[PDB]
Amino acid sequence: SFSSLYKTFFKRNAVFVGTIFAGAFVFQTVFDTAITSWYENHNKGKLWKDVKARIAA
Amino acid sequence: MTAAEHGLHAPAYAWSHNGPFETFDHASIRRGYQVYREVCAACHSLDRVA
Amino acid sequence: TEFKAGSAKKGATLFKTRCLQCHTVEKGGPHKVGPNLHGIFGRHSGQAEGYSYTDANIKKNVLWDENNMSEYLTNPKKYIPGTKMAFGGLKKEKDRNDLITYLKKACE
Amino acid sequence: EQAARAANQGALPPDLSLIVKARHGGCDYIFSLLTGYPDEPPAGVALPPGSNYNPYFPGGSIAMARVLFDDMVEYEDGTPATTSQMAKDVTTFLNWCAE
Amino acid sequence: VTDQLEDLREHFKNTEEGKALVHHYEECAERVKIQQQQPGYADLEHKEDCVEEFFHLQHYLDTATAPRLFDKLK
Ligand code: HEM
Ligand code: HEM
Ligand SMILES: OC[C@H]1O[C@@](CO)(O[C@H]2O[C@H](CO)[C@@H](O)[C@H](O)[C@H]2O)[C@@H](O)[C@@H]1O
């Protein structure tokens, strides 16, 4: 949160509701994908997907 | 309460699903079903599992 | 002719830990989860008086001998499908041979 | 229930769908129970006819006998079916059944 | 391949602490074996057992085998 960086996008105004709501939509998507990828990778080998693959014979 | 009455304390094994970030080991679940079917099922029901 | 005589001592331990929970061997012994096994050899399946067998066991009508006993103990429900007997099975032939050896002696 | 008890000398084997959450100790208790049957009870302990000794069970006298023995099951994936391996696997399956 | 828990338990029964504990249980067992041979044992109401000694032994074994067992399993 650098003053100059904030000012380039919002010019001394607080973030408006419309932008907050719009930003919440994007966050929801990116965050979920990020968490899911981290979680599945952390448990690699234990998941059904990994076990189903192992059963190739 | 005597030790016998209470029962021996069960020690802590390192289950791979222990811990906030850990899922179950699904290969172990699969194998466990086989043990249930071939051994436990003769006397034990699993009524709430569809 | 697959059955080979083994150690009756080792067979007694197998009976204690694997069969005693549901069976008794002494003459005139009481029935439990399974019927008393005294006089089982040379007799047909499902004939011990006082015990309620399944139709699957009775209809099997197996004249019990050392060899079919060996095949039965390997996997009970495969030999007599529809039987109440809940047993894990003795995969090793040495275990069967020893267990049967003890059983033969127990009802002589 | 009548048939159940008749097949277990009067005792009723509980449904296992929630056993892991229905016992203090959870997976540890279930596992320790299945692998905790000694060959003989401690000296001076009179075991009620039909009972089995297991230190992890309150009172030490349990109507269930040891049921897991080495290699009694042939694992599809090749895993050696030892008593502890089977106990570990079935307990994990039961934890999933409960949760 | 023998049972991994059995192996670990056998190993720890052999440590110094494991041997002292088995000794204490075995000593109690012998003492109880003698009491039973005595006349009128069935009528005492204060019969000694070795559950406590067995528990001390098992607790020690569990403390050592519990954190090690799963590394040996699949
Ligand atoms: C590996 C397969 C099995 C599992 C996982 C299992 C698990 C359990 C558990 C967790 C209990 C509850 C003990 C408690 O109240 O704390 C129990 C009780 C019991 N089980 Fe099993 N069991 C298995 C196989 C069997 C078999 C094959 C039989 C029948 C031959 C059997 C008969 C019983 C009985 C009679 C009880 C009641 C014990 C009592 O309340 O005194 N179980 N079992
Ligand atoms: C290796 C150990 C065992 C041996 C040698 C053994 C042997 C036998 C034999 C030869 C029979 C046939 C009886 C007849 O036709 O008269 C039988 C029946 C039976 N056994 Fe076992 N048994 C063993 C363990 C068990 C166990 C652990 C249980 C209880 C959980 C059990 C439950 C029964 C029952 C319920 C029957 C009646 C079968 C039916 O009516 O369908 N047995 N057993
Ligand atoms: O009801 C089981 C029946 O088995 C016996 C056989 O001696 O008990 C032995 O085997 C059990 C199976 O694990 C043990 O729990 C028990 O401690 C051991 O003595 C009978 O005593 C018992 O009634």
Short mmCIF file of C-alpha atoms and ligand atoms in Angstrom, two decimals:
data_model
loop_
_atom_site.label_atom_id
_atom_site.label_comp_id
_atom_site.label_asym_id
_atom_site.label_seq_id
_atom_site.Cartn_x
_atom_site.Cartn_y
_atom_site.Cartn_z
CA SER A 1 0.00 0.00 0.00
CA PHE A 2 2.15 2.85 -1.32
CA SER A 3 0.59 6.32 -1.44
CA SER A 4 1.66 6.91 -5.06
CA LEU A 5 0.38 3.50 -6.15
CA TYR A 6 -3.01 4.07 -4.49
CA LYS A 7 -3.31 7.56 -5.98
CA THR A 8 -2.73 6.34 -9.56
CA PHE A 9 -5.93 4.29 -9.31
CA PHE A 10 -8.07 6.23 -6.81
CA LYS A 11 -6.89 9.90 -6.60
CA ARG A 12 -7.50 10.73 -2.90
CA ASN A 13 -11.01 9.21 -3.05
CA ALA A 14 -11.95 6.09 -1.08
CA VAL A 15 -12.85 3.02 -3.15
CA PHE A 16 -16.54 3.19 -4.17
CA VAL A 17 -19.07 0.37 -3.50
CA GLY A 18 -19.43 -0.59 -7.16
CA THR A 19 -15.69 -1.22 -7.40
CA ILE A 20 -15.62 -2.99 -4.02
CA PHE A 21 -18.37 -5.38 -5.19
CA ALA A 22 -16.68 -5.89 -8.57
CA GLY A 23 -13.37 -6.52 -6.84
CA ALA A 24 -15.01 -9.05 -4.50
CA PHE A 25 -16.19 -11.07 -7.51
CA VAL A 26 -12.67 -11.31 -8.97
CA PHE A 27 -11.16 -12.12 -5.56
CA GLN A 28 -13.63 -14.97 -5.02
CA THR A 29 -12.48 -16.68 -8.27
CA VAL A 30 -8.71 -16.17 -7.98
CA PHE A 31 -8.60 -16.94 -4.26
CA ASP A 32 -10.55 -20.19 -4.62
CA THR A 33 -8.35 -21.42 -7.46
CA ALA A 34 -5.21 -20.42 -5.54
CA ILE A 35 -6.28 -22.20 -2.33
CA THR A 36 -7.51 -25.28 -4.18
CA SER A 37 -4.23 -25.61 -6.12
CA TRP A 38 -2.15 -25.20 -2.96
CA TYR A 39 -4.32 -27.65 -0.99
CA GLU A 40 -4.35 -30.37 -3.65
CA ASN A 41 -0.61 -30.03 -4.24
CA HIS A 42 0.10 -30.28 -0.50
CA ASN A 43 -1.82 -33.57 -0.43
CA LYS A 44 -0.46 -34.94 -3.72
CA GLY A 45 -0.56 -38.73 -3.68
CA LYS A 46 -3.40 -39.01 -1.16
CA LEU A 47 -6.22 -37.70 -3.35
CA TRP A 48 -8.54 -40.02 -5.26
CA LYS A 49 -7.36 -38.46 -8.55
CA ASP A 50 -3.79 -39.50 -7.73
CA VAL A 51 -4.88 -42.98 -6.58
CA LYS A 52 -7.11 -43.56 -9.62
CA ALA A 53 -4.11 -42.71 -11.82
CA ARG A 54 -1.89 -45.12 -9.86
CA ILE A 55 -4.35 -47.94 -10.61
CA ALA A 56 -3.17 -48.25 -14.22
CA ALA A 57 -2.66 -52.03 -14.11
CA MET B 1 -11.59 -44.97 39.07
CA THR B 2 -9.05 -47.79 38.70
CA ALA B 3 -6.84 -48.11 35.63
CA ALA B 4 -8.69 -51.26 34.53
CA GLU B 5 -12.10 -49.55 34.72
CA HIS B 6 -10.94 -46.54 32.72
CA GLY B 7 -9.08 -48.54 30.11
CA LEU B 8 -5.51 -47.99 28.91
CA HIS B 9 -4.95 -44.61 27.27
CA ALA B 10 -4.62 -44.96 23.48
CA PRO B 11 -1.32 -43.45 22.22
CA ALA B 12 -1.03 -40.92 19.39
CA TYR B 13 -0.20 -42.46 16.02
CA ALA B 14 0.84 -40.30 13.08
CA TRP B 15 -2.33 -40.49 10.96
CA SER B 16 -1.68 -38.78 7.62
CA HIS B 17 -5.02 -36.95 7.98
CA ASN B 18 -3.96 -35.40 11.33
CA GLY B 19 -3.23 -31.72 10.91
CA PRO B 20 -5.19 -28.71 9.54
CA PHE B 21 -3.89 -28.98 5.96
CA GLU B 22 -4.16 -32.78 5.59
CA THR B 23 -6.68 -34.79 3.58
CA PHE B 24 -7.38 -38.48 4.07
CA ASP B 25 -5.14 -40.95 2.21
CA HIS B 26 -7.69 -42.32 -0.28
CA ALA B 27 -5.66 -45.44 -1.10
CA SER B 28 -5.86 -46.29 2.59
CA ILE B 29 -9.64 -45.66 2.58
CA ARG B 30 -10.00 -47.98 -0.45
CA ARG B 31 -7.96 -50.74 1.23
CA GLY B 32 -9.91 -50.18 4.43
CA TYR B 33 -13.18 -50.83 2.66
CA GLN B 34 -11.85 -54.25 1.60
CA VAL B 35 -10.95 -55.06 5.21
CA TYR B 36 -14.46 -53.97 6.29
CA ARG B 37 -16.12 -56.15 3.61
CA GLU B 38 -14.03 -59.28 4.15
CA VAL B 39 -13.75 -59.13 7.94
CA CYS B 40 -15.91 -56.59 9.81
CA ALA B 41 -19.12 -56.84 7.73
CA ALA B 42 -19.89 -60.32 9.12
CA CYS B 43 -20.89 -58.72 12.42
CA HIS B 44 -20.92 -54.96 11.79
CA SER B 45 -23.40 -52.84 9.87
CA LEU B 46 -22.59 -49.56 8.09
CA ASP B 47 -26.19 -48.29 7.90
CA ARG B 48 -25.57 -44.58 7.42
CA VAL B 49 -23.29 -45.00 4.39
CA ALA B 50 -24.91 -44.91 0.94
CA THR C 1 -3.98 -86.79 -0.04
CA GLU C 2 -2.99 -83.13 0.44
CA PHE C 3 -3.40 -83.23 4.22
CA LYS C 4 -0.11 -83.91 6.02
CA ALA C 5 0.04 -84.66 9.76
CA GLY C 6 1.59 -81.81 11.74
CA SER C 7 2.08 -80.50 15.27
CA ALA C 8 -0.96 -80.91 17.51
CA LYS C 9 0.57 -78.37 19.89
CA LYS C 10 0.63 -75.62 17.26
CA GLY C 11 -2.86 -76.64 16.15
CA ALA C 12 -4.21 -76.18 19.67
CA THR C 13 -2.98 -72.56 19.67
CA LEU C 14 -4.62 -71.99 16.28
CA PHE C 15 -7.88 -73.37 17.65
CA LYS C 16 -7.61 -71.24 20.79
CA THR C 17 -7.04 -67.98 18.90
CA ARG C 18 -9.03 -68.71 15.74
CA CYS C 19 -11.92 -71.04 16.63
CA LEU C 20 -12.50 -71.27 20.40
CA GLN C 21 -14.53 -68.04 20.32
CA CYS C 22 -17.35 -69.83 18.46
CA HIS C 23 -16.57 -73.54 19.02
CA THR C 24 -16.03 -76.16 21.74
CA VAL C 25 -14.40 -79.58 21.21
CA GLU C 26 -15.09 -81.75 24.28
CA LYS C 27 -17.66 -84.56 24.10
CA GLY C 28 -21.02 -83.19 25.23
CA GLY C 29 -19.72 -79.64 24.98
CA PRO C 30 -22.23 -76.75 24.66
CA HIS C 31 -23.01 -74.92 21.41
CA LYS C 32 -22.03 -71.25 21.08
CA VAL C 33 -21.92 -69.12 17.92
CA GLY C 34 -21.05 -72.33 16.11
CA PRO C 35 -22.00 -75.96 16.92
CA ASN C 36 -19.83 -78.20 19.12
CA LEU C 37 -17.31 -79.97 16.88
CA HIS C 38 -16.87 -83.32 18.66
CA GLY C 39 -17.49 -86.23 16.29
CA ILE C 40 -17.37 -83.92 13.26
CA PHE C 41 -15.11 -86.20 11.18
CA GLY C 42 -16.90 -89.11 9.56
CA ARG C 43 -20.16 -87.22 10.06
CA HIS C 44 -22.15 -85.14 7.56
CA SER C 45 -22.42 -81.35 7.87
CA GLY C 46 -25.31 -79.83 9.80
CA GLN C 47 -26.24 -82.82 11.95
CA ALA C 48 -25.27 -81.91 15.53
CA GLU C 49 -28.53 -82.02 17.51
CA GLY C 50 -29.53 -78.86 19.34
CA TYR C 51 -27.98 -76.43 16.85
CA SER C 52 -29.76 -74.41 14.17
CA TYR C 53 -27.71 -74.55 10.96
CA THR C 54 -28.36 -72.68 7.72
CA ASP C 55 -29.95 -74.52 4.80
CA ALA C 56 -26.70 -73.87 2.89
CA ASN C 57 -24.71 -75.90 5.44
CA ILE C 58 -27.25 -78.73 5.61
CA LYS C 59 -27.79 -78.91 1.83
CA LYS C 60 -24.01 -79.08 1.41
CA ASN C 61 -24.14 -82.50 3.10
CA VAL C 62 -20.35 -82.78 3.27
CA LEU C 63 -18.96 -85.97 4.79
CA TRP C 64 -16.18 -84.31 6.78
CA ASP C 65 -12.67 -85.65 6.22
CA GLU C 66 -9.19 -84.10 6.59
CA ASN C 67 -9.01 -82.89 2.98
CA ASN C 68 -12.37 -81.17 2.47
CA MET C 69 -11.91 -79.69 5.96
CA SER C 70 -8.65 -78.19 4.66
CA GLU C 71 -10.40 -76.65 1.65
CA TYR C 72 -13.25 -75.38 3.85
CA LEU C 73 -10.92 -73.69 6.36
CA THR C 74 -9.08 -71.98 3.48
CA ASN C 75 -12.22 -69.97 2.66
CA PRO C 76 -15.48 -71.07 4.40
CA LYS C 77 -17.99 -69.00 2.43
CA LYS C 78 -16.43 -70.04 -0.88
CA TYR C 79 -16.83 -73.75 -0.05
CA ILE C 80 -20.27 -73.44 1.58
CA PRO C 81 -21.79 -70.18 0.25
CA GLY C 82 -24.57 -68.91 2.50
CA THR C 83 -23.05 -70.17 5.76
CA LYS C 84 -23.19 -68.28 9.07
CA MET C 85 -19.53 -69.07 9.82
CA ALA C 86 -17.50 -65.86 9.96
CA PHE C 87 -13.86 -66.90 9.56
CA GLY C 88 -10.83 -65.26 7.93
CA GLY C 89 -9.29 -68.40 6.46
CA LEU C 90 -5.95 -70.16 6.79
CA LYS C 91 -4.04 -69.44 3.57
CA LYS C 92 -0.91 -71.33 4.65
CA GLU C 93 -1.13 -75.10 4.22
CA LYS C 94 1.05 -75.63 7.30
CA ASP C 95 -1.54 -73.88 9.49
CA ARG C 96 -4.37 -76.01 8.09
CA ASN C 97 -2.36 -79.22 8.44
CA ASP C 98 -1.56 -78.39 12.08
CA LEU C 99 -5.08 -77.21 12.96
CA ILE C 100 -6.70 -80.32 11.43
CA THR C 101 -4.14 -82.53 13.22
CA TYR C 102 -5.27 -81.07 16.55
CA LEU C 103 -8.93 -81.43 15.55
CA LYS C 104 -8.43 -85.11 14.70
CA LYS C 105 -6.91 -85.74 18.13
CA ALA C 106 -9.52 -83.63 19.98
CA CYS C 107 -12.36 -85.96 18.99
CA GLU C 108 -10.74 -89.42 19.20
CA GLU D 1 -31.11 -56.86 16.98
CA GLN D 2 -32.34 -60.27 18.21
CA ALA D 3 -30.52 -62.07 15.38
CA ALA D 4 -27.44 -59.91 15.98
CA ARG D 5 -27.24 -60.83 19.65
CA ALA D 6 -27.98 -64.51 18.95
CA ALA D 7 -24.94 -64.61 16.67
CA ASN D 8 -22.63 -63.01 19.27
CA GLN D 9 -23.50 -64.71 22.57
CA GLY D 10 -25.90 -61.97 23.68
CA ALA D 11 -23.76 -58.98 22.65
CA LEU D 12 -24.71 -56.43 20.02
CA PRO D 13 -21.95 -55.32 17.61
CA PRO D 14 -22.54 -51.57 17.10
CA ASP D 15 -23.03 -49.95 13.72
CA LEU D 16 -19.65 -48.52 12.66
CA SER D 17 -20.78 -45.56 10.52
CA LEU D 18 -19.95 -43.12 13.34
CA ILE D 19 -17.71 -45.22 15.62
CA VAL D 20 -14.69 -42.93 15.17
CA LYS D 21 -16.64 -39.89 16.40
CA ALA D 22 -18.58 -41.93 19.00
CA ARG D 23 -15.53 -42.97 21.01
CA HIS D 24 -13.04 -40.97 23.04
CA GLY D 25 -9.70 -41.39 21.28
CA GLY D 26 -11.07 -41.54 17.75
CA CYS D 27 -8.77 -43.25 15.27
CA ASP D 28 -6.15 -43.91 17.97
CA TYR D 29 -8.60 -45.82 20.13
CA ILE D 30 -10.04 -47.87 17.24
CA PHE D 31 -6.55 -48.76 16.03
CA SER D 32 -5.20 -49.56 19.52
CA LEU D 33 -8.24 -51.77 20.22
CA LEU D 34 -7.85 -53.85 17.05
CA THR D 35 -4.11 -54.35 17.63
CA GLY D 36 -4.28 -54.55 21.42
CA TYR D 37 -5.42 -58.09 22.17
CA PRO D 38 -2.71 -59.90 24.21
CA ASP D 39 -2.49 -63.70 23.94
CA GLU D 40 -3.54 -63.98 27.57
CA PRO D 41 -5.03 -61.57 30.14
CA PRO D 42 -2.80 -60.23 32.96
CA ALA D 43 -2.38 -62.52 35.96
CA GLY D 44 -5.20 -62.46 38.51
CA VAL D 45 -7.75 -61.30 35.95
CA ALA D 46 -10.83 -63.53 35.77
CA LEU D 47 -12.29 -63.16 32.29
CA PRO D 48 -16.09 -63.77 32.10
CA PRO D 49 -16.86 -66.81 29.86
CA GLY D 50 -17.24 -65.57 26.29
CA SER D 51 -15.21 -62.42 26.95
CA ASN D 52 -11.84 -61.35 25.61
CA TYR D 53 -9.17 -59.24 27.30
CA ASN D 54 -8.15 -55.93 25.76
CA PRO D 55 -6.55 -53.23 27.97
CA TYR D 56 -7.85 -50.35 25.84
CA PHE D 57 -11.50 -51.31 26.44
CA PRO D 58 -12.97 -49.84 29.66
CA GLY D 59 -13.20 -52.72 32.12
CA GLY D 60 -10.81 -54.81 30.01
CA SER D 61 -13.51 -57.38 29.19
CA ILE D 62 -14.83 -57.10 25.60
CA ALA D 63 -17.29 -59.37 23.73
CA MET D 64 -15.33 -58.97 20.48
CA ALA D 65 -12.32 -61.25 20.03
CA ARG D 66 -9.23 -60.37 18.00
CA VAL D 67 -10.27 -60.61 14.35
CA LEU D 68 -7.21 -59.28 12.50
CA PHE D 69 -4.37 -61.71 11.74
CA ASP D 70 -1.47 -61.37 9.29
CA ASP D 71 -2.27 -61.92 5.59
CA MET D 72 -5.97 -62.72 6.10
CA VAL D 73 -6.74 -60.35 3.22
CA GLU D 74 -5.04 -60.06 -0.15
CA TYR D 75 -4.56 -56.38 -0.97
CA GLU D 76 -5.41 -55.50 -4.56
CA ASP D 77 -2.51 -53.02 -4.77
CA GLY D 78 0.17 -55.35 -3.40
CA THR D 79 0.46 -53.87 0.11
CA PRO D 80 1.51 -56.48 2.73
CA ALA D 81 -1.60 -57.27 4.77
CA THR D 82 -0.13 -57.29 8.27
CA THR D 83 -2.37 -56.92 11.33
CA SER D 84 -1.29 -53.31 11.93
CA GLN D 85 -1.59 -52.37 8.25
CA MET D 86 -5.15 -53.69 8.09
CA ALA D 87 -6.03 -51.95 11.36
CA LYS D 88 -4.59 -48.69 10.04
CA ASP D 89 -6.47 -48.98 6.73
CA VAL D 90 -9.85 -49.99 8.19
CA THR D 91 -9.67 -47.23 10.83
CA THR D 92 -9.01 -44.67 8.08
CA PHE D 93 -12.01 -46.00 6.12
CA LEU D 94 -14.16 -45.78 9.28
CA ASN D 95 -13.00 -42.17 9.90
CA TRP D 96 -14.16 -41.32 6.37
CA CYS D 97 -17.49 -43.10 7.02
CA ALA D 98 -17.97 -40.91 10.10
CA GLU D 99 -16.70 -37.68 8.51
CA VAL E 1 6.85 -59.76 6.35
CA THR E 2 5.89 -59.93 10.03
CA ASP E 3 3.70 -57.38 11.83
CA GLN E 4 5.49 -54.03 12.16
CA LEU E 5 3.88 -53.21 15.53
CA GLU E 6 4.89 -56.61 16.93
CA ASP E 7 8.50 -56.01 15.83
CA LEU E 8 8.62 -52.56 17.44
CA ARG E 9 7.04 -53.85 20.66
CA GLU E 10 9.57 -56.70 20.84
CA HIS E 11 12.43 -54.23 20.29
CA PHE E 12 11.33 -51.95 23.15
CA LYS E 13 10.65 -54.80 25.61
CA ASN E 14 14.45 -55.27 25.34
CA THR E 15 15.55 -51.76 26.33
CA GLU E 16 16.62 -51.16 29.92
CA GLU E 17 13.26 -49.57 30.79
CA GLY E 18 11.36 -52.26 28.91
CA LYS E 19 13.15 -55.02 30.83
CA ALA E 20 12.57 -53.41 34.25
CA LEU E 21 8.84 -53.15 33.44
CA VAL E 22 8.51 -56.75 32.19
CA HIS E 23 10.40 -57.79 35.34
CA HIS E 24 7.94 -55.94 37.60
CA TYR E 25 4.98 -57.56 35.81
CA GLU E 26 6.57 -61.02 35.89
CA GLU E 27 7.28 -60.59 39.61
CA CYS E 28 3.61 -59.71 40.20
CA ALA E 29 2.50 -62.65 38.05
CA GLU E 30 4.58 -65.12 40.07
CA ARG E 31 3.25 -63.68 43.34
CA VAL E 32 -0.32 -64.09 42.06
CA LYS E 33 0.41 -67.63 40.83
CA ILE E 34 1.38 -68.51 44.41
CA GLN E 35 -1.70 -66.90 46.00
CA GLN E 36 -3.94 -69.01 43.75
CA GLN E 37 -2.35 -72.27 44.91
CA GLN E 38 -3.22 -71.38 48.51
CA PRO E 39 -6.28 -73.00 50.19
CA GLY E 40 -9.49 -70.97 50.05
CA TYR E 41 -8.40 -68.61 47.28
CA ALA E 42 -11.94 -68.42 45.87
CA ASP E 43 -12.99 -66.79 49.15
CA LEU E 44 -10.82 -63.70 49.71
CA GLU E 45 -12.59 -60.68 48.15
CA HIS E 46 -9.17 -58.95 48.04
CA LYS E 47 -7.49 -60.88 45.21
CA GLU E 48 -4.50 -59.12 43.65
CA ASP E 49 -4.15 -58.82 39.88
CA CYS E 50 -1.37 -57.48 37.66
CA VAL E 51 -3.31 -55.01 35.52
CA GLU E 52 -1.41 -52.02 36.92
CA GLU E 53 1.98 -53.61 36.19
CA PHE E 54 0.81 -54.63 32.70
CA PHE E 55 -0.45 -51.06 32.10
CA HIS E 56 2.91 -49.54 33.08
CA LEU E 57 4.60 -51.86 30.60
CA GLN E 58 2.12 -51.21 27.78
CA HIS E 59 2.13 -47.44 28.31
CA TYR E 60 5.91 -47.38 27.95
CA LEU E 61 5.75 -49.50 24.79
CA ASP E 62 2.98 -47.31 23.33
CA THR E 63 4.99 -44.14 24.06
CA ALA E 64 7.86 -45.57 21.98
CA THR E 65 6.00 -47.41 19.20
CA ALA E 66 3.20 -44.90 18.53
CA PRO E 67 5.38 -42.17 16.93
CA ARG E 68 7.36 -44.75 14.92
CA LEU E 69 4.80 -47.26 13.65
CA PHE E 70 3.24 -45.40 10.71
CA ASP E 71 6.60 -44.69 9.05
CA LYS E 72 6.76 -48.50 8.70
CA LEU E 73 3.25 -48.79 7.18
CA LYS E 74 1.84 -48.05 3.73
C1 HEM F 1 -11.68 -55.41 11.45
C2 HEM F 1 -13.20 -55.59 11.42
C3 HEM F 1 -13.85 -55.01 12.69
C4 HEM F 1 -13.81 -53.76 13.21
C5 HEM F 1 -13.16 -52.53 12.63
C6 HEM F 1 -14.52 -53.81 14.46
C7 HEM F 1 -14.65 -52.73 15.32
C8 HEM F 1 -15.33 -52.72 16.52
C9 HEM F 1 -15.41 -51.60 17.42
C10 HEM F 1 -14.72 -50.25 17.22
C11 HEM F 1 -16.21 -51.97 18.44
C12 HEM F 1 -16.67 -51.09 19.55
C13 HEM F 1 -16.00 -51.33 20.88
C14 HEM F 1 -16.42 -50.29 21.91
O1 HEM F 1 -17.58 -50.35 22.38
O2 HEM F 1 -15.60 -49.42 22.25
C15 HEM F 1 -16.57 -53.35 18.22
C16 HEM F 1 -17.40 -54.10 19.04
C17 HEM F 1 -17.80 -55.42 18.80
N1 HEM F 1 -17.43 -56.18 17.71
FE1 HEM F 1 -16.25 -55.63 16.21
N2 HEM F 1 -15.06 -55.06 14.67
C18 HEM F 1 -14.66 -55.81 13.58
C19 HEM F 1 -15.01 -57.14 13.36
C20 HEM F 1 -15.83 -57.91 14.19
C21 HEM F 1 -16.27 -59.24 13.89
C22 HEM F 1 -15.88 -60.01 12.64
C23 HEM F 1 -17.17 -59.58 14.84
C24 HEM F 1 -18.11 -60.79 14.94
C25 HEM F 1 -17.36 -62.12 14.81
C26 HEM F 1 -17.20 -58.51 15.80
C27 HEM F 1 -17.98 -58.47 16.96
C28 HEM F 1 -18.08 -57.39 17.84
C29 HEM F 1 -18.83 -57.40 19.08
C30 HEM F 1 -19.63 -58.59 19.60
C31 HEM F 1 -18.66 -56.19 19.66
C32 HEM F 1 -19.22 -55.72 21.01
C33 HEM F 1 -18.13 -55.65 22.07
C34 HEM F 1 -18.64 -55.24 23.44
O3 HEM F 1 -19.43 -54.28 23.54
O4 HEM F 1 -18.23 -55.87 24.43
N3 HEM F 1 -16.41 -57.47 15.36
N4 HEM F 1 -16.02 -53.79 17.04
C1 HEM F 2 -10.31 -72.27 12.17
C2 HEM F 2 -11.32 -72.07 13.30
C3 HEM F 2 -12.63 -72.83 13.06
C4 HEM F 2 -12.89 -74.13 12.81
C5 HEM F 2 -11.88 -75.27 12.74
C6 HEM F 2 -14.30 -74.24 12.52
C7 HEM F 2 -14.93 -75.38 12.05
C8 HEM F 2 -16.27 -75.51 11.73
C9 HEM F 2 -16.86 -76.63 11.05
C10 HEM F 2 -16.12 -77.87 10.57
C11 HEM F 2 -18.19 -76.37 10.92
C12 HEM F 2 -19.22 -77.31 10.35
C13 HEM F 2 -20.12 -77.77 11.48
C14 HEM F 2 -21.08 -78.87 11.06
O1 HEM F 2 -21.36 -78.99 9.84
O2 HEM F 2 -21.55 -79.60 11.95
C15 HEM F 2 -18.41 -75.04 11.45
C16 HEM F 2 -19.64 -74.38 11.49
C17 HEM F 2 -19.87 -73.10 12.00
N1 HEM F 2 -18.89 -72.27 12.52
FE1 HEM F 2 -16.90 -72.64 12.63
N2 HEM F 2 -14.91 -73.02 12.74
C18 HEM F 2 -13.91 -72.15 13.10
C19 HEM F 2 -14.10 -70.82 13.49
C20 HEM F 2 -15.34 -70.18 13.60
C21 HEM F 2 -15.55 -68.83 14.07
C22 HEM F 2 -14.46 -67.84 14.46
C23 HEM F 2 -16.88 -68.66 14.21
C24 HEM F 2 -17.77 -67.63 14.87
C25 HEM F 2 -17.50 -66.19 14.42
C26 HEM F 2 -17.52 -69.82 13.62
C27 HEM F 2 -18.89 -69.98 13.43
C28 HEM F 2 -19.53 -71.11 12.91
C29 HEM F 2 -20.94 -71.22 12.64
C30 HEM F 2 -21.99 -70.14 12.93
C31 HEM F 2 -21.15 -72.42 12.04
C32 HEM F 2 -22.49 -72.89 11.45
C33 HEM F 2 -22.50 -72.73 9.94
C34 HEM F 2 -23.90 -72.69 9.34
O3 HEM F 2 -24.87 -73.16 9.98
O4 HEM F 2 -24.03 -72.19 8.21
N3 HEM F 2 -16.56 -70.76 13.33
N4 HEM F 2 -17.22 -74.52 11.90
O1 LIG F 3 -14.84 -65.77 23.68
C1 LIG F 3 -13.47 -65.90 23.29
C2 LIG F 3 -12.85 -67.01 24.09
O2 LIG F 3 -11.52 -67.24 23.62
C3 LIG F 3 -10.68 -67.55 24.74
C4 LIG F 3 -9.85 -68.79 24.39
O3 LIG F 3 -8.98 -69.16 25.46
O4 LIG F 3 -9.91 -66.39 25.06
C5 LIG F 3 -8.57 -66.28 24.53
O5 LIG F 3 -8.61 -65.69 23.19
C6 LIG F 3 -9.21 -64.40 23.19
C7 LIG F 3 -9.20 -63.91 21.73
O6 LIG F 3 -8.37 -62.75 21.59
C8 LIG F 3 -8.48 -63.47 24.16
O7 LIG F 3 -9.11 -62.20 24.17
C9 LIG F 3 -8.52 -64.03 25.57
O8 LIG F 3 -7.84 -63.15 26.47
C10 LIG F 3 -7.82 -65.38 25.50
O9 LIG F 3 -7.81 -65.98 26.81
C11 LIG F 3 -11.65 -67.75 25.91
O10 LIG F 3 -11.06 -67.46 27.18
C12 LIG F 3 -12.73 -66.73 25.58
O11 LIG F 3 -13.96 -66.97 26.26
#
